[PDB]
Short mmCIF file of C-alpha atoms in Angstrom, two decimals:
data_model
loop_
_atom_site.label_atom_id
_atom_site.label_comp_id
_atom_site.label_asym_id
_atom_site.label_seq_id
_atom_site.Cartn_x
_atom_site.Cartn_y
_atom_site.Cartn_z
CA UNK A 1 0.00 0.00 0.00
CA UNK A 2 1.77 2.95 -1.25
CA UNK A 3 -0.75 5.83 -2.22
CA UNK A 4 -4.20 5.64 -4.17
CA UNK A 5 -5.64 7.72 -6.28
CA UNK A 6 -5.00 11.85 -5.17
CA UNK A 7 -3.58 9.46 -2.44
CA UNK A 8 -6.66 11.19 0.10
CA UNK A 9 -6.64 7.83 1.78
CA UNK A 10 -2.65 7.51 2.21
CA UNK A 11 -2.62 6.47 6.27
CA UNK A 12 0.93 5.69 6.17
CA UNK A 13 4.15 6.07 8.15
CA UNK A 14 6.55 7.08 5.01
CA UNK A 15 8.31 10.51 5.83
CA UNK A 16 10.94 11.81 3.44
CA UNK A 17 10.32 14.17 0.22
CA UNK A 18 11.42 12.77 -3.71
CA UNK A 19 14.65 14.71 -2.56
CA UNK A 20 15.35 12.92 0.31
CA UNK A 21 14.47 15.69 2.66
CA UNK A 22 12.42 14.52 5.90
CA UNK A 23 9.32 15.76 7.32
CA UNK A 24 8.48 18.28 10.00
CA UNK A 25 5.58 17.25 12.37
CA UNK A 26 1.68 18.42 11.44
CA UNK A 27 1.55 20.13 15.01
CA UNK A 28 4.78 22.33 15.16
CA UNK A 29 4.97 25.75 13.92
CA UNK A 30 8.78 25.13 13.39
CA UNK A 31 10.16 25.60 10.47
CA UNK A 32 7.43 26.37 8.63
CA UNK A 33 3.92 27.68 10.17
CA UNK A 34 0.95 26.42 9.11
CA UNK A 35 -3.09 25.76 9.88
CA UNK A 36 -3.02 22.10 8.34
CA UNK A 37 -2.77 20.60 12.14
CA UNK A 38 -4.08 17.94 13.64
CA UNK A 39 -6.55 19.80 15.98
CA UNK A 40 -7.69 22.13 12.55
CA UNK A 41 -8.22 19.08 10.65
CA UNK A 42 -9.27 16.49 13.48
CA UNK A 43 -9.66 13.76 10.33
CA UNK A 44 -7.27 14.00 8.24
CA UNK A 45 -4.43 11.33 9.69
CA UNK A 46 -2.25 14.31 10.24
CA UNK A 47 -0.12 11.71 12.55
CA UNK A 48 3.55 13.01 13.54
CA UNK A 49 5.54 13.38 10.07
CA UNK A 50 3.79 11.02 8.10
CA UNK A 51 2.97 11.80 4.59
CA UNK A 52 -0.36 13.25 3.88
CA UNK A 53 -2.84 14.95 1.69
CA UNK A 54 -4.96 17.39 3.75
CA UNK A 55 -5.87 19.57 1.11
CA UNK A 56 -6.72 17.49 -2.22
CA UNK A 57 -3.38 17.93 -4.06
CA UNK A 58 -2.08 15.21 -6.14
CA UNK A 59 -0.76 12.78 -4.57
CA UNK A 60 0.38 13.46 -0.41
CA UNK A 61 3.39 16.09 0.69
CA UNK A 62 4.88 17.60 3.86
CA UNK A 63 6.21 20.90 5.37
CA UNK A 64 10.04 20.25 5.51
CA UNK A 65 12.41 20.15 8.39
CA UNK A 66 14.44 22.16 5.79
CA UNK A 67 13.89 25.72 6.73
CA UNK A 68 14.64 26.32 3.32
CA UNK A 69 12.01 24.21 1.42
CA UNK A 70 8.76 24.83 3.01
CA UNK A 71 6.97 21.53 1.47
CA UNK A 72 7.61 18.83 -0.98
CA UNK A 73 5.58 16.13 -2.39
CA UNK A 74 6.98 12.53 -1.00
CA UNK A 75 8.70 9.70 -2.76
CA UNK A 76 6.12 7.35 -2.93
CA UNK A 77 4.51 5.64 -6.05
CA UNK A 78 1.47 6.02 -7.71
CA UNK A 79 -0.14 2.35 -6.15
#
């Protein structure tokens, strides 16, 4: 189980960007700031780091632990 579809449904535990970058926690403000939490979007698997897809994009990202790169999709495949 990689991703499906818009991969809306990805529940889990992968955590690094197609760059090899890893992923900043959905609850921390740090680097990056943003409203796409856990207690904003109670059902949305927001777990930890984990790769997800909150908003409908194509296919599910992350904020970066790179203060530099706000967000990134993640290197998973299209299942």
């Amino acid at each position: 189980q990689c991703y499906h579809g818009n991969g809306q449904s990805y529940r889990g535990t992968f955590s690094t960007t197609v760059t090899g970058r890893t992923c900043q926690s959905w609850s921390s403000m740090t680097p990056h700031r943003h409203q796409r939490t856990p207690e904003n979007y109670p059902n949305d698997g927001l777990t930890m780091n984990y790769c997800r897809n909150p908003d409908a994009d194509t296919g599910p990202w992350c904020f970066t632990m790179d203060p530099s790169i706000r967000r990134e999709y993640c290197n998973l495949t299209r299942c």
